[PDB]
């Protein structure tokens, strides 16, 4: 099982300036629940976006995808191809935009948090992957984050 997990604005923006223009504690909790105990695969830029304090993410096989053969990710596994990272029953790809696009053919699940924020796309933004017609989704109920933004969960799946 390869799954993708991300949060996006209604515009599809997932990242800007190397970070994320929101923070939902409820989404972080759902992220930890979904990924705990499994392999997480992330691009080098996303590993850069994690503070040194919190990486590697606890209780998970942290894998970083990089073309730099000498890149050091303390506490993580650095691989040069995505296939190297899929040696486990459950692999969760956790960002960023490049690695989502790279991993989509392998994926049968997308856990998508839609954040009700009006965020026009800018040059340089990281964007969520386009899901074609093979994907079957369950649109969720709008929820209120204590951060003040409304959010909902899409759980997409395909055979």
Ligand X SMILES: NC(=O)c1ccc[n+]([C@@H]2O[C@H](COP(=O)([O-])OP(=O)(O)OC[C@H]3O[C@@H](n4cnc5c(N)ncnc54)[C@H](OP(=O)(O)O)[C@@H]3O)[C@@H](O)[C@H]2O)c1
Ligand Y SMILES: O=C(O)c1cccc(CSc2cccs2)c1
* CB of 43 or CB of 156, closer to ligand Y: 43
Residue 44: φ, ψ to 5°: -60, -40
Among ligand Y, ligand X, none, residue 50 binds (CB under 5-8 Å by kind): ligand Y
7, 132 Cβ separation under 8 angstroms: no
Residue 17: φ, ψ to 5°: 70, 25
- Interface with ligand X, residue 99, by CB under 6 A: yes
What is the SS3 assignment for 132?
coil
Which residue stretch of 40-48, 85-93, 136-144, 146-154 sits at the interface with ligand X (rule: CB under 6 A)?
40-48
Give the CA distances from residue 142 to residues 115, 145, 146, 152, 154, in Å, rounded to whole numbers and listed in that order. 9, 10, 13, 5, 10
* CB of 52 or CB of 130, closer to ligand Y: 52
Of residues 101, 70, 63, the one with CA closest to residue 85:
63
Shortest distance in whole angstroms from residue 134 CB to ligand Y: 25
Shortest distance in whole angstroms from residue 76 CB to ligand X: 12
**Binding-site residue ranges:** 5-7, 14-19, 27, 32, 43-46, 60, 65-68, 80, 94-100, 113
Binding site for ligand X (CB under 6 A): 6-7, 14-15, 18-20, 43-46, 49, 65-68, 71, 80-81, 94-99, 102, 126
């Amino acid at each position: 099982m390869v799954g993708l997990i991300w949060a996006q604005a209604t515009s599809g923006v997932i990242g800007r300036g190397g970070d994320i223009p929101w923070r939902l504690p409820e989404d972080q909790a759902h992220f930890r629940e979904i990924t705990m105990g499994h392999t997480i695969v992330m691009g080098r830029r996303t590993w850069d976006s994690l503070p040194a304090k919190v990486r590697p993410l606890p209780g998970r096989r942290n894998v970083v995808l990089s073309r730099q053969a000498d890149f050091m990710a303390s506490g993580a596994e650095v691989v040069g191809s995505l296939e190297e990272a899929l040696t486990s029953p459950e692999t969760w790809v956790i960002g960023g935009g490049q690695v989502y696009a790279l991993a989509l053919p392998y994926a049968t699940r997308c856990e998508v948090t839609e954040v009700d924020i009006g965020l026009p796309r800018e040059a340089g933004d990281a964007l969520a992957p386009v899901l074609d017609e093979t994907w079957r989704g369950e649109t969720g109920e709008w929820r209120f984050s204590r951060s003040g933004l409304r959010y909902r969960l899409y759980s997409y799946h395909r055979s």
